[PDB]
Design a protein around this ligand. Structure first.
Ligand SMILES: Nc1nc2c(ncn2[C@@H]2O[C@H](COP(=O)(O)OP(=O)(O)OP(=O)(O)O)[C@@H](O)[C@H]2O)c(=O)[nH]1
Ligand SMILES: [Mg+2]
Ligand SMILES: [Mg+2]
Ligand SMILES: [Mg+2]
Ligand SMILES: [Mg+2]
Ligand SMILES: [Mg+2]
Ligand SMILES: [Mg+2]
Ligand SMILES: [Mg+2]
Ligand SMILES: [Mg+2]
Ligand SMILES: [Mg+2]
Ligand SMILES: [Mg+2]
Ligand SMILES: [Mg+2]
Ligand SMILES: [Mg+2]
Ligand SMILES: [Mg+2]
Ligand SMILES: [Mg+2]
Ligand SMILES: [Mg+2]
Ligand SMILES: [Mg+2]
Ligand SMILES: [Mg+2]
Ligand SMILES: [Mg+2]
Ligand SMILES: [Mg+2]
Lengths: 26, 191, 139, 97, 189, 117, 176, 45, 41
RNA sequence: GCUAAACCUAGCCCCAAACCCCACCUUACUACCAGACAACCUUAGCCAAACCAUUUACAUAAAGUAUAGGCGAUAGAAAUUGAUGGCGCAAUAGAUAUAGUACCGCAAGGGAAAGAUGAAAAACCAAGCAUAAUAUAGCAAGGACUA
RNA sequence: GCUACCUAAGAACAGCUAAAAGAGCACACCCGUCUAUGUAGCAAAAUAGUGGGAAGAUUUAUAGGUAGAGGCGACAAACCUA
RNA sequence: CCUCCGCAUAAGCCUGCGUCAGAUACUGACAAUUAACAGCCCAAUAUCUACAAUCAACCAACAAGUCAUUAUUACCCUCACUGUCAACCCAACACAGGCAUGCUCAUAAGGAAAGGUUAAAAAAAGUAAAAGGAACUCGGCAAAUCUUACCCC
C-alpha cells in the first residue's frame, strides 16, 4: 500500500465517472 | 498454537478449527483490549443483557466464553440462521446460530432487580473475592457418580499409609519384599 | 528404565535393580501372518530383548520362550507446507514366542441428530409434475 | 493497478494533544531565563548530535568518536567502512574540485 | 462440546390433526404464559399468516424469521428464491378457529383456515408460471403454529395438507418426465 | 549429502552400521572371537511387587475431597521423622537419630545416586 | 497374562468407557513408599492397555473409546513420579545437602559457552581417561570475538522484542 | 563426462567435514562458531 | 519508500487517452503510445 | 469476462534508557578403561599520489595551527579550555528472515519466495487474451472527410 | 568423494598361438584413432560404427596423504570438484 | 519380438509402484525389514616367527613375496546391541552417461523398438545395383575388400 489519499480520491472519482458512463442514470 | 492464531467460535482444536485456520494462514491479528483476569466479570451461566445490535435489551444466559477474544455467547440470543446438513440434494434444516458479543456490548444483570448493572470486584471479609453491583449494591453470585471397577474408593484414596522415614523407595521396597543384597557397590569415578 | 543414568557396574558389584519401570509397551496386531505362538509388541527404542523378556515375565507372568527385535524406520519423506520433512518416529518391534505351547491370537477389538433424521425423512422431494413451482402455497 | 481501489481509512489528527499544544515551550529558555540553560540543551536524541549538525561524513566521524567504543561489532565495522567510503567520495569525487 | 445448538423449534408436528380433550395442553400453555386465550388465538394466527405471506411477497426474510419457525422458513423460501411471488389475501370465507393443541417445551396449535387468496409466480425473467394476478382462489388449510417456552412467540410451524385435498392449480408449462436411462447391457421392460 | 536427517545406525557402511547403537544400555562385554559375555548383574532386574490384595485402582473416585498441594520439603521430612525423637531425647551422635555421615557403604547411595529411578 | 494388555471383554467395542479421576500429587503424598511402588505397576499395566487400545484404534481407523483415560493415567504416573522424586530429593538434601542427584560442574566448553557438564561414571581416573582428555573444557582467545557477536545478536533480538511490545501497547492504548 | 564429482562415501564425509575434524583445529572451531552465529541448523556435516 | 508516486495511473492515462484510436499495441502500451502520441502531436 | 487487480499488519529501522530427565569433542548429540598434545608471534592489499617504488586518514576550542611529508599526494598533535520517542518503512519497502528455513555447493559458504473475507465460517482498473481474424499502400499518424 | 602423484592392504584379466615374453590374435575391462549423428543434444563432451591396449610402466574398489608465494606433473604451462 | 542383460554382496540413498481411502510413480492413514548372514572383539609382561605364490610335485626364476608361537601370571559364574524394505546410487530429470565384486555366458531371470494414419520433399541409419572401378577427393574420407612395395620422424 502506498501512503496517500489524494491519488486514491482521484481514482475513486474516475471510477464513479466510469460507472456512470457504463450504467447511465435514468 | 500458531503465532497470532485467530481464535474463533469453534474450539481451538476441532476439525472445523483446523479447516478454517490451517497452519499456513497469516491473517491480520484481531485487536482485543487487554482485560486482566482480575477484571473479567462475565462467567459461563451468568445472566446478561444485550446492549447493541439485534435483540438489544433482551436478557439471556452466557453459554460460552472465548476469553482470548473478549467474547461471551448468549444462548439463543444474537442469532443469525444457518443451514446444517445441506447436501447436494437436500436443502438442509435452518438452525439459529448465536454470534459472539463483546463484554463492552454485554452487561451483567442483577439477581433480583433484573436490570443491567455495573460491577466491581470488591473484597468481602467472607467472600474474599466476589462481584458487587455499583448502582444498587448487592452481590451477584457466581453461577455453576458411581465408582467403576477401576476407581479407588474414597476411603482407600484418602488412607494415609505414609509413615515418614529416612528411607528411599528403593531400600524400603527391598525390605518389604525381602530382597537381600550383600555385594557392596564399588566406588566409581565421576567426571 | 529410559532417560536415566544406569549405575556403573564393576566386577563383584550388586545386582542392577529397577523398581519403577519407565518402559511402556504396546501389544499390536501383526501386519502379516504370524505363528500362533507369536505376539507382536511396539517397544521403546532403549529396551533390549532381555529387558522385554524380564518385563513380560515379571509384570505379566507371561511365559516367554523367545524374543526378537527389529528397529523399524519411520518415513521421513512427508513434507509440511514449508517443504520441511516431517519425520515419522522410528520404533522398535519385538516378536515374542510364548513357551509351553501356549497360543495367542489378537482379540477382536471393536466388534439434534433426531431432528435432522426426521427432517430428512420429511424431505418430500420435488414432484416432477410441479415443474419447479414451490409447494408451500396451497392455491 | 498501482492505485488502491478504496479510499484509505480516514486519518484523524488531534491538533490539540499535549505534544502539539505545548510544542515550542521553553525554546526561549536562555533569553527568558538569564541564560542559565542553552536551548540546545532541550534537544533529546543521540548523544553525538545533541546541538550539533554536519554532513554524513562529519556525523559518522562524530558517532565513531563519541560512542564508537560502545557500538556493536558489526555496526562499528559498518561505521568504519562508511567513514572510509565517504572520505573517498567527498575528497576525490564530484563535479567541482 | 460444552456449548450445544440451541434449537428454537421442533422437527415436526407433535400429533397430526387428521382432518375430516386437549384442555390439558391448554392448561400447560396457560401455566407457562398466564395470559393466553384459545378463543382469541384465531385472529392472531390469521394475522401472523397474512404478515408472513406478505413478507414472502416482499422478500422480507428478517420478518419471516420472526413470523415463522426455522422448520418453516426453508420450506417457504427455498423454492421461491430467484423468483417473484405476488401473493395477496382478499377475504376469509369462514372465521378462523382453533382445532387441535398439543404440547425445552413447545406448544403447537393447529388452526383451520378456509380463506380466499391469489397467486402469481414469475420466473427469473418475469414470465408468469403459476396462478393469475387477479383471479381469487378458495384455499382450505391447517396451519400448525408453535411457541417456545422466555422471548419466544407464536410462529407458523407447518401446514398439514389433507390426503383428500383437491389437486392444486395446474402448471402453465408442459413437463417431460424421462424414462429409464438404460445402459447398453440393459433392456426396457 | 543429507545433513538435516538424524545420524542413525541405518546410515553408513557395514562398520558404521554395526558400531552405532540405538541407546540401549550395555548388558556385557565382548571377548576374543566376538563372543558376547552377558553379565547378569548388568541386566536390570524389574523388582515387581505382589499386587494381590492391593486396593488402589489406577483411577480415583470423582467423589473425593480436594486438598491443597503441599510439595514435601526437607524441613517437613525432618519435622515428621527426626524432630519427635530429637525432642524426646532432648527432654530425656546424630547417627542414632538417623543422620548418616557418608553415603559410602550403602547399597543405595543418595549422592552420587547409584540406583535406577 | 496377555489379556492384561486389553480392556475388559465386556468393555470391548463400547463407545465410551467411564473412568475416575487421575491420582493427584496431594493424594499420592499420603501413600507409603510400598503403596506407591505397587500403584506404579498398576498404572503401568493400565497405560500399556490404553496404548494398545490407541494403536488398535489407529489400525482399525476408528476413534479410541474414551481417549481421556490415557491422559489421566499419564498424569497419575507423572504425579507418582513427582512424589517419589520429592521424597528422594528431601532425603538427599537432609543427608548430603546436594540439590542434584547427578554430580556436575559449571564448565566453559571449547566454544566459550558456560555449560553444566554432567559427570559420567568411569572406572579410571580423569587424568588417565584418554577420551575425556581429548574433550576440551577451555575456550581459546579466538572465541572472544564470537562470544561478543553472539551477545550482540541476543541484545538485538531482545531490543527488537521490547520495542515491538511498546509499539503494540501504544497502539492498543490509542485504540482503547 | 563431468558433473558426477560427488562419489558419496560416509567415511570420507565424516572424516573430512565432521564435528571431530572441525574441532580438531582452531580454524574449524571458528567455522563451527560462524555456523552457530549465523544460526545454521547443521553446524557440521 | 519514503516518497512514492501515486498518480502514475493518471500520468499514463493523460497520454493513452490520445492513443486510444491508434492501431496495435501503440494504443495500450505506454512505452509505445507515448512515442506515437508525440509523433502525432 | 478470464487472467487478474488492489488492501493492513506481520513485523522491521534509528535512537533513549538500561549492562547482558537423557545424549553430545569417537563418525557430536554415542552409558562404562593407563592420559600426556595442548594457546600468545608486526596484518596485508586494494586505493591516492592521475604510473609506481618512500608515503596514503581508520563534547567544543586551540586547529586544520605547531609539525611530518618522493617537503607531494597527503598525514597531523599537545600545552590549554571545559563537558524521552520518530516531518522512520509498510510485504519488490523495512532485518536476508514466515528463515538462516527451503534450495544450491564435498566444504567453507551462498541463500529465497510469500499473507490479505468477515462481528461471527458453530453465517470497474496493467500487460495478455475473449467477446469480435482479415481487404490494395507502406514508422501506421496527421490534414481531413459525409464516409 | 573429480583429477595429478603417492601410502596401506585388496580384486580383475575368457579363449587361441606361443612359452617364464613391458610377446601376437582376441573377450570382459581400460582408452579414445577416424567417420557419421548430435550441437538448448540421451549427454554442460554423448550415441553408432571403426579403432589402440588388453599379464602389465595394466585396470580398478576401499581408507589415508601432498592445498594455492602451494600441491602434483612419463612438461600438455597438464590436473587440483564442470 | 529383445535380451545390452539378470540375481545377489559391497558402496550409496533412506521408505521412494505393499494395503486402504481420496483426489486431481500424487496426497493421508495403516502395515513392514525378526539372526544363524554381516558389523560390533581380544588381560598382561617378555619371548618366538631365514626357507614365497604359481594344482607345489618336477623345472623355472626375479620384481624376492599376506597368512606360524612359546614361557609365566590372571581368567567363566552369563548368546546382548546394530544393518536387513524398495522399481533405489552419482549426473539439476523415469538422463541413450558413470558405477566395484560373485554366479548365470544366454538365461529358469529381466524386458518392449511401433499413440493412430499416410508413405511428400529435405535429413539420419541400412540393404541392393547394369557397364566402369578412385576417373571422386586436400587425402581411398566413408564404404566395400583383406590387400604389395617403399620413404620421413
Ligand atoms: N526514545 C525512546 N524512549 C523509549 C524507548 N522505550 C521506552 N521509552 C520511553 O520510556 C518511558 C517509559 O516507558 P514506559 O513503557 O511507559 O514505562 P516503563 O516500562 O517504566 O519504562 P522503562 O523503565 O524504560 O522500561 C517513556 O517516556 C517511553 O517513551 C525507546 O526505545 N526509545
Ligand atoms: Mg537384528
Ligand atoms: Mg572414485
Ligand atoms: Mg596510484
Ligand atoms: Mg583516477
Ligand atoms: Mg588536549
Ligand atoms: Mg522482504
Ligand atoms: Mg486489459
Ligand atoms: Mg589371457
Ligand atoms: Mg602384450
Ligand atoms: Mg612443451
Ligand atoms: Mg606453450
Ligand atoms: Mg547433467
Ligand atoms: Mg514403445
Ligand atoms: Mg508416430
Ligand atoms: Mg555398381
Ligand atoms: Mg584423382
Ligand atoms: Mg588402384
Ligand atoms: Mg578432379
Ligand atoms: Mg576407412
Amino acid at each position: 500500500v502506498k501512503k496517500g489519499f489524494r491519488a486514491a480520491f482521484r481514482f475513486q472519482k474516475e471510477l464513479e465517472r466510469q460507472r456512470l458512463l457504463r450504467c447511465p442514470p435514468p | 498454537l500458531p503465532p497470532h492464531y485467530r481464535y474463533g467460535m469453534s474450539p481451538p482444536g476441532s476439525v472445523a478449527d483446523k479447516r478454517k485456520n490451517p497452519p499456513w494462514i497469516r491473517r491480520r491479528p484481531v485487536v482485543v483490549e487487554p482485560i486482566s483476569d482480575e477484571d473479567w466479570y462475565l462467567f459461563c451461566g451468568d445472566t446478561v443483557e444485550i446492549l447493541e445490535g439485534k435483540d438489544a435489551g433482551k436478557q439471556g444466559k452466557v453459554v460460552q466464553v472465548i476469553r482470548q477474544r473478549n467474547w461471551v455467547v448468549v444462548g439463543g440470543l444474537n442469532t443469525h440462521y444457518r443451514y446444517i446438513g445441506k447436501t447436494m440434494d437436500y436443502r438442509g434444516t435452518m438452525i439459529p446460530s448465536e454470534a459472539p458479543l463483546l463484554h463492552r456490548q454485554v452487561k451483567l444483570v442483577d439477581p433480583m432487580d433484573r436490570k443491567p448493572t455495573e460491577i466491581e470486584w470488591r473484597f468481602t471479609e467472607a467472600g474474599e473475592r466476589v462481584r458487587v453491583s455499583t448502582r444498587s449494591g448487592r452481590i451477584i453470585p457466581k453461577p455453576e457418580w458411581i465408582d467403576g471397577p477401576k476407581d479407588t474408593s474414597v476411603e482407600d484414596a484418602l488412607e494415609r499409609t505414609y509413615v515418614p522415614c529416612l528411607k528411599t523407595l528403593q531400600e524400603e521396597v527391598m525390605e518389604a519384599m525381602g530382597i537381600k543384597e550383600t555385594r557392596k557397590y564399588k566406588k566409581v569415578y565421576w567426571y | 528404565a529410559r532417560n536415566v543414568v544406569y549405575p556403573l557396574y564393576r566386577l563383584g558389584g550388586p545386582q542392577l535393580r529397577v523398581f519403577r519401570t519407565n518402559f511402556f509397551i504396546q501389544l499390536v496386531r501383526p501386519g502379516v501372518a504370524q505363528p500362533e505362538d507369536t505376539v507382536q509388541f511396539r517397544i521403546p527404542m532403549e529396551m533390549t530383548r532381555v529387558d522385554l523378556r524380564n518385563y513380560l515375565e515379571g509384570i505379566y507372568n507371561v511365559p516367554v520362550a523367545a524374543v526378537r527385535t527389529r528397529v523399524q524406520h519411520g518415513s521421513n519423506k512427508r513434507r509440511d507446507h514449508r517443504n520441511v520433512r516431517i519425520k515419522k518416529p522410528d520404533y522398535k518391534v519385538a516378536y515374542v514366542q510364548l513357551a509351553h505351547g501356549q497360543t495367542f491370537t489378537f482379540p477382536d477389538l471393536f466388534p439434534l441428530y433426531s431432528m435432522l433424521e426426521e427432517e430428512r425423512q420429511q424431505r418430500q422431494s420435488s414432484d416432477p409434475r410441479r415443474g419447479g413451482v414451490p409447494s408451500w402455497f396451497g392455491l | 493497478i498501482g492505485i488502491r481501489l478504496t479510499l484509505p481509512p480516514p486519518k484523524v489528527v488531534d491538533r490539540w494533544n499535549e505534544k502539539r499544544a505545548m510544542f515550542g515551550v521553553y525554546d526561549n529558555i536562555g533569553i527568558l531565563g538569564n541564560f542559565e540553560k542553552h536551548p540546545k540543551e532541550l534537544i533529546r536524541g543521540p548523544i553525538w548530535l545533541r546541538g550539533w549538525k554536519g554532513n554524513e561524513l562529519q556525523r559518522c566521524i562524530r558517532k565513531r568518536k563519541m560512542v564508537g567504543s560502545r557500538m556493536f561489532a558489526d555496526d562499528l565495522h559498518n561505521l568504519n567502512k562508511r567513514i572510509r567510503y565517504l572520505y573517498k567520495h567527498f575528497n576525490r569525487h564530484g563535479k567541482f574540485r | 462440546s460444552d456449548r450445544s445448538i440451541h434449537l428454537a423449534c421442533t422437527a415436526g408436528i407433535f400429533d397430526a390433526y387428521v382432518p375430516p380433550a386437549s384442555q390439558v395442553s391448554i392448561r400447560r400453555i396457560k401455566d407457562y404464559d398466564a395470559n393466553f386465550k384459545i378463543k382469541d388465538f384465531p385472529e392472531k394466527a390469521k394475522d401472523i399468516f397474512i404478515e408472513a405471506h406478505l413478507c414472502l411477497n416482499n422478500s422480507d426474510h428478517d420478518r419471516l424469521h420472526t413470523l415463522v419457525t426455522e422448520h418453516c422458513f426453508p420450506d417457504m423460501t427455498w423454492d421461491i428464491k430467484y423468483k417473484t411471488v405476488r401473493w395477496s389475501f382478499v377475504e376469509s370465507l369462514e372465521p378462523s378457529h382453533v382445532v387441535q393443541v398439543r404440547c425445552n417445551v413447545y406448544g403447537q396449535i393447529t388452526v383451520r383456515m378456509h380463506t380466499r387468496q391469489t397467486l402469481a409466480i414469475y420466473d427469473r425473467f418475469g414470465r408468469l408460471m403459476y396462478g393469475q394476478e387477479d383471479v381469487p382462489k378458495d384455499v382450505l388449510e391447517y396451519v400448525v403454529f408453535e411457541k417456545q417456552l422466555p422471548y419466544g412467540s407464536w410462529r407458523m410451524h407447518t401446514k398439514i395438507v389433507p390426503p383428500w385435498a383437491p389437486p392444486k392449480q395446474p402448471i402453465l408449462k408442459t413437463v417431460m418426465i424421462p424414462g429409464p436411462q438404460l445402459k447398453p447391457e440393459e433392456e426396457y421392460e | 549429502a543429507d545433513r538435516m536427517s538424524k545420524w542413525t545406525s541405518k546410515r553408513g557402511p557395514r562398520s558404521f552400521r554395526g558400531r552405532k547403537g540405538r541407546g540401549a544400555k550395555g548388558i556385557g562385554f565382548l571377548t576374543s572371537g566376538w563372543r558376547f559375555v552377558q553379565i547378569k548383574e548388568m541386566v536390570p532386574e524389574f523388582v515387581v511387587p505382589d499386587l494381590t490384595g492391593f486396593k488402589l485402582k489406577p483411577y480415583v473416585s470423582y467423589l473425593a475431597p480436594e486438598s491443597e498441594e503441599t510439595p514435601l520439603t526437607a524441613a517437613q521430612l525432618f519435622s515428621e521423622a527426626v524432630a519427635p525423637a530429637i525432642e524426646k531425647d532432648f527432654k530425656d551422635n546424630l547417627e542414632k537419630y538417623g543422620f548418616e555421615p557418608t553415603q559410602e557403604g550403602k547399597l543405595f547411595q543418595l549422592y552420587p545416586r547409584n540406583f535406577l529411578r | 497374562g496377555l489379556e492384561e494388555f486389553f480392556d475388559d471383554p465386556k468393555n470391548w467395542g463400547q463407545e465410551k468407557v467411564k473412568s475416575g479421576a487421575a491420582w493427584t500429587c496431594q493424594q499420592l503424598r499420603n501413600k507409603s513408599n510400598e503403596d506407591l511402588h505397587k500403584l506404579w505397576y498398576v498404572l503401568l499395566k493400565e497405560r500399556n492397555m490404553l496404548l494398545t487400545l490407541e494403536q488398535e484404534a489407529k489400525r482399525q481407523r476408528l476413534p479410541m473409546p474414551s481417549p481421556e483415560r490415557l491422559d489421566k493415567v499419564v498424569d497419575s504416573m507423572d504425579a507418582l513420579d513427582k512424589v517419589v522424586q520429592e521424597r528422594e530429593d528431601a532425603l538427599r538434601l537432609l543427608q548430603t545437602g546436594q540439590e542434584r542427584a547427578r554430580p556436575g560442574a559449571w564448565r566453559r566448553d571449547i566454544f566459550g559457552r558456560i555449560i553444566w557438564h554432567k559427570f559420567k561414571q568411569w572406572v579410571i581416573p580423569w587424568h588417565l581417561n584418554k577420551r575425556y582428555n581429548r574433550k576440551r573444557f577451555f575456550a581459546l582467545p579466538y572465541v572472544d570475538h564470537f562470544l561478543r557477536l553472539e551477545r550482540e545478536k541476543r541484545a538485538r533480538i531482545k531490543a527488537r522484542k521490547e520495542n515491538l511490545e511498546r509499539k503494540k501497547a501504544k497502539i492498543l492504548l490509542k485504540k482503547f | 563426462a563431468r558433473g558426477n564429482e560427488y562419489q558419496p562415501s560416509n567415511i570420507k564425509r565424516k572424516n573430512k567435514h565432521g564435528w571431530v575434524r572441525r574441532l580438531s583445529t582452531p580454524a574449524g572451531v571458528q567455522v563451527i562458531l560462524r555456523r552457530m552465529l549465523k544460526g545454521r541448523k547443521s553446524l557440521s556435516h | 519508500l519514503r516518497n512514492r508516486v501515486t498518480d502514475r495511473y493518471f500520468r499514463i492515462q493523460e497520454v493513452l487517452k490520445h492513443a486510444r484510436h491508434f492501431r496495435g499495441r501503440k494504443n495500450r502500451c505506454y512505452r509505445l503510445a507515448v512515442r506515437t502520441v508525440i509523433r502525432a502531436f
